[PDB]
Amino acid sequence: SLSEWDVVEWSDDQAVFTFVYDTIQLTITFEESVVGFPFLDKRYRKIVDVNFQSLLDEDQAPPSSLLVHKLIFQYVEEKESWKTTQHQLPKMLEEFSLVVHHCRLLGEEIEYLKRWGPNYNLMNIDINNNELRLLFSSSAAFAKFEITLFLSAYYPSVPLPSTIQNHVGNTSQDDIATILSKVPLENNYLKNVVKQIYQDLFQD
Ligand SMILES: [Cl-]
């Protein structure tokens, strides 16, 4: 059948496997040439290296796509810093496909917010590495604040650290932490947090 990758390639000695998801590449190096059926086997095979490569032009890409690529980059980087036991191909690949899927979704949410954000009083979006900064502002509501959300490739399944810089009104860290907690850790998390913030703090 198929998987979430467009293409799988391997070396002539079959020790190095490349998996491609558009502009994203994951390279897996086995201790020795792979024999048998790596996805069906269930055979212990020693993996000595896992590498992320990116085909992305940082100069010709929306900051959102860059964020996406940076999150997967950092995800694979931190994964490899484990150096008694290692993950095995099928598992590695399942998790990775899911991570890529969800991070691409996230990029789309960012695009939605860049376009439609003023409808929720979201007047600025800034991305710095993995930090997403959202400025909410309304003279009418008498509320202005910027929350910093620290994202990860595990998005949206994990709770987000956050920080707030308050300017006008009474909005606090606690209020924001509360809102983040109420929204279900699943698809559209970010769009749903923005909506929650709008309803609670700007409709009110
Ligand atoms: Cl196979």
Side-chain angles (χ1 to χ4, degrees), residues 2-83 85-204:
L2 288 178
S3 280
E4 219 219 4
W5 64 71
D6 312 338
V7 186
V8 176
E9 294 177 23
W10 51 92
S11 54
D12 284 349
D13 66 355
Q14 305 156 47
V16 192
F17 286 66
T18 305
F19 302 81
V20 186
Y21 302 69
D22 200 12
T23 57
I24 284 142
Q25 260 194 15
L26 182 72
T27 305
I28 293 161
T29 303
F30 285 89
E31 176 152 45
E32 45 203 339
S33 317
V34 164
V35 171
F37 312 140
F39 297 88
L40 328 157
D41 277 352
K42 305 279 193 302
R43 282 170 147 264
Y44 176 81
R45 261 170 295 247
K46 176 69 160 187
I47 293 168
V48 288
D49 206 6
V50 186
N51 279 105
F52 166 92
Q53 292 82 226
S54 178
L55 320 160
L56 192 90
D57 181 13
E58 178 202 11
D59 298 308
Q60 169 72 345
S64 60
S65 293
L66 185 66
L67 166 68
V68 164
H69 283 239
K70 281 202 203 186
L71 291 172
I72 307 174
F73 184 152
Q74 195 52 31
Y75 162 82
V76 179
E77 282 276 294
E78 292 164 354
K79 220 83 177 169
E80 192 184 341
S81 294
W82 53 6
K83 291 151 285 209
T85 50
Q86 312 136 176
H87 277 207
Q88 295 279 285
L89 191 67
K91 150 184 264 282
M92 210 160 315
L93 265 297
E94 290 178 7
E95 287 193 11
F96 191 80
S97 294
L98 206 63
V99 152
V100 169
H101 169 79
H102 275 126
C103 281
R104 291 219 261 250
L105 252 18
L106 166 64
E108 238 66 73
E109 290 182 68
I110 299 273
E111 288 303 324
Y112 177 98
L113 296 166
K114 300 221 177 206
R115 175 39 177 66
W116 297 63
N119 296 355
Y120 313 86
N121 297 116
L122 170 50
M123 306 296 109
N124 197 49
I125 304 178
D126 172 69
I127 310 187
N128 186 37
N129 297 335
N130 69 313
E131 296 149 31
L132 180 72
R133 266 163 270 255
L134 303 174
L135 181 63
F136 287 94
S137 199
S138 175
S139 61
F142 201 61
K144 182 181 188 184
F145 59 83
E146 194 175 48
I147 66 205
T148 298
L149 291 185
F150 306 70
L151 307 172
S152 86
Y154 300 102
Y155 174 93
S157 63
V158 295
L160 299 179
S162 76
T163 235
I164 183 179
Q165 196 204 6
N166 193 53
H167 289 293
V168 179
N170 309 323
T171 310
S172 61
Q173 180 64 31
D174 183 35
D175 304 320
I176 300 300
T178 290
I179 296 186
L180 298 173
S181 304
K182 301 181 311 176
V183 183
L185 288 176
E186 64 180 43
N187 285 15
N188 298 311
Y189 181 80
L190 177 64
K191 290 188 315 191
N192 289 341
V193 165
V194 177
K195 284 148 196 184
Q196 269 314 306
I197 288 162
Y198 174 68
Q199 297 181 348
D200 296 358
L201 302 177
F202 289 92
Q203 275 196 339
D204 302 9

